Amino acid sequence: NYTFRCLQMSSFANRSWSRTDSVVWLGDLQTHRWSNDSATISFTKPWSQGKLSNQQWEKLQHMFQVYRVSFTRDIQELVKMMSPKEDYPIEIQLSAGCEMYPGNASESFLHVAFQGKYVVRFWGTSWQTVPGAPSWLDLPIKVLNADQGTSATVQMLLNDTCPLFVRGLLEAGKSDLEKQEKPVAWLSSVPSRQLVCHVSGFYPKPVWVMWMRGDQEQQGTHRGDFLPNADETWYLQATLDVEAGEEAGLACRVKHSSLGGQDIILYW
């Protein structure tokens, strides 16, 4: 049930200075990156071309080499259009791609944030402002929608190219997408008093961590957030309040796909 995400982040500091950087994710694995300094898009995975031929890829990259330069000048020209209404510094963020579902069905999106607020999306055959968006955007929208050729292409990329590509990505990357990596747990404590159960290096993300006295799951166990490691595995911790002296006989228990049913039991 994997989501393919292109994340464009563009900064516009003043009239002249601008940079645009993207990353691409399939699920929670990075497949591409494209740094403002690079003329071309980089693969972060051996399979990042999916099942596209070299022709199909070059053509796709070229589509984008031109979009990057063009997007930039268009935002600049729109700032000229609104001013002094709106002004630099400006941050535009794009989130685009498609979610793939059982078998054939899919759903594409293209969402735009301005100054970190979601305001615009491509939907159907045109750009439209979403709810809560400021009315002034109605001018940029009307101008963007005048560009018939940009619209036709965006429709083609959302409707056809994106799911086609992702269909092929999932095939090329099954091996990495389905990798199983065992977590490793350790315990530690701090004053307030508070026990910690560190679980690190597991993949994929779904995991279970509860403190326990025997077979008794503790009420107050607090799951922290999933933190990433640099080698594409996950880190999580779980904390539990205790009166000093009560540490005796407490276990951290970890369930996870990689372990094939041998839960990690760590006593204190």
Partner: T-cell receptor, first 111, second 113 residues
Amino acid sequence: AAVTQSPRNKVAVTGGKVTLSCNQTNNHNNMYWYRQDTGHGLRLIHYSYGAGSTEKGDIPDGYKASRPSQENFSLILELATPSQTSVYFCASGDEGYTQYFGPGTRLLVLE
Amino acid sequence: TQVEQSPQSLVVRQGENCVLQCNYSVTPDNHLRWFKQDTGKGLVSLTVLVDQKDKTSNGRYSATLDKDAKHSTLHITATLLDDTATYICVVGDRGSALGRLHFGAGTQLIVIP
């Protein structure tokens, strides 16, 4: 989709203030000024996206722009020089890609 | 100088056909427009080509555009005296007012009556 320029032809001395005017009734938000010199294609000097705004084009040096209103776009040369001898076209457009051109104004600046 | 026209000038006898060429490196190339400009006058639009491989016509004028070759030609069938004019190629880099027009320097046609 009509555009007028005034004057249509001007003789001016070095150091003179010259004003070239453009008017359009189409309610077009967008106006543009260009000069045409043989052996070159048209070149953009200044443009405007609406009343009270102007923007530098590719060759702005020696020209000021004035957009007092929706109808009017003016090219002002404060200190005219012989090098501004040319034919000047004004243009207008809505959001779409077409620019509708004026009939052009010929200028000669003498010493 | 991203829009080159050829030939720079030509002389034809009334009744003859001619082909004018335009070659560009503008990016992107949304559309291409041919203007006709009579000596001492304004720019009259003959045709605008917008598709990847495109063909248009307007009386004795016809034109082609190939966006891969970044090439356009303009054909005048059975020239007449009033075709004496400068013919100007123009490329527009957006499908909207966000664009800039890139003008060729033109081709000068003289028709011997």
